[PDB]
């Protein structure tokens, strides 16, 4: 339920609560109480589609409450 960055990786995973890991210094900011998502390798950034919001890019741009997730995270697939 967001509008991420330009990563076209796979069916991403996302959460808002984020802790910082220190052990294992190739991965930073491991994500907490995380929830699944599927965009199924869609073209553009806005496709998140948890359960209800797939089409309607105008309604997606209206859905800017919890959006603009940076995506640069523990994995090119996994988003913020």
């Amino acid at each position: 339920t967001m509008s991420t960055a330009y990563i076209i990786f796979n069916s991403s995973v996302a959460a808002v609560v984020d802790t910082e890991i220190a052990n294992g210094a190739n991965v930073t900011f491991s994500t907490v109480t995380v929830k699944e998502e599927i965009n199924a390798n869609r073209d553009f950034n806005l496709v998140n589609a948890q359960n209800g919001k797939i089409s309607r890019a105008k309604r997606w741009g209206n859905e800017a409450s919890k959006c603009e997730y940076f995506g640069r995270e523990i994995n090119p697939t996994e988003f913020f």
Partner: protein, 331 residues
């Protein structure tokens, strides 16, 4: 045709309680009901910079400037009282039983064939091979995770509370029993048959487990952490039930089921915890790789579908993976 079950999950057996940590003196072991609780308390620290800097930002004038302002954390720790040396860890373990009957299947023929295969497994051999190994990880007190190393003498002690009273008591010594070999003692077979009859289902089994570890005056115990989700900084909050430091009821119990010795490239590297795709994070990598055919899922689907019964040294693994529970459906 018996295709795979779309949604299948299992209720666990072998539930552990939460672990309590108390403190005292070693000579007062046999009257240790009212030992005070190892409380958590806040302290402050002051770190430095001890991480591998990258090749670009290795300037000389920047490193001393970055360590001129250190990072003042605020750590919670737990120490024993300065007059006490022996750490008492108490938790209770209940043995449910009926390990085959699932929680939420889809096909009735899958569920009936699953219960038929598990009934054959309990019919030919007992749970005795899968209970002489749980009794070990109650004996050599692996559930003391980091409090075990460097302990002087670890006396573990286990009671059978059938009624409110005790039925039959047991004392061990967790360093006479090694952390690698699975020996055969006279008082790890009266316990192993008890967990065997508890898992088969011929009674009810509730076990009180206390474990005294001799660490020393004023030393530092280790309980389990928590999350620090979302300045006023803090790091490393420990987990206390009612201001008594506590090990989680799944970090305990994770040491109950490090049983798995039957896995490839076993170089005497000791048992690991039972898991589907049987893996440990501390070793970094994941054994029982699915490209090998010695997994769990491709061991269940070749035993409940096509009936190719694997070796008995893997039917001791599949049933134990059923005992821990979990989800197993195409989620």
């Amino acid at each position: 045709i018996l295709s795979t079950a779309s949604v299948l999950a299992f209720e666990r057996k072998l539930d552990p309680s939460d672990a309590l940590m108390s403190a005292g003196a070693w000579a007062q072991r046999d009257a240790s009901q009212e030992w005070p609780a190892v409380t958590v308390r806040e302290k402050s620290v002051r770190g430095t910079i001890s991480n591998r800097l990258k090749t670009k930002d290795r300037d000389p004038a920047k490193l001393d400037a970055s360590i001129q302002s250190p990072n003042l954390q605020t750590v919670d720790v737990a120490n024993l009282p300065s007059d006490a040396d022996t750490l008492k860890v108490r938790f209770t373990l209940r043995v449910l039983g009926g390990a085959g009957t699932p929680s939420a299947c889809n096909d009735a023929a899958y569920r009936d064939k699953l219960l038929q295969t598990v009934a054959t497994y309990v019919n030919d051999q007992g749970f005795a091979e899968l209970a002489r190994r749980y009794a070990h990880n109650l004996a050599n007190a692996r559930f003391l995770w980091r409090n075990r190393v460097g302990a002087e003498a670890v006396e573990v002690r286990i009671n059978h509370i059938r009624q409110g009273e005790v039925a039959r008591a047991w004392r061990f010594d967790a360093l006479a029993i090694g952390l690698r070999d699975f020996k055969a003692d006279a008082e790890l077979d009266a316990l192993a048959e008890l967990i065997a009859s508890g898992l088969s289902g011929s009674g009810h089994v509730l076990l009180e487990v206390v474990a005294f570890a001799r660490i020393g005056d004023g030393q530092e115990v280790f309980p389990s952490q928590e999350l620090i989700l979302d300045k006023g900084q803090k790091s490393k909050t420990l987990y206390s039930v009612r201001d008594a430091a506590a090990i989680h009821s799944q970090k305990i119990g994770n040491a109950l089921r490090t049983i798995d010795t039957w896995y490839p490239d076993e170089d005497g590297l000791g048992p690991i915890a039972v898991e589907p795709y049987g893996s440990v994070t501390s070793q970094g990598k994941a054994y029982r790789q699915p490209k090998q055919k010695l997994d769990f899922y491709t061991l269940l689907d070749n035993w409940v579908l096509r009936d190719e019964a694997p070796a008995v040294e893997q039917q001791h693994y599949v049933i134990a993976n059923l005992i821990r529970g979990g989800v197993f459906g195409e989620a």
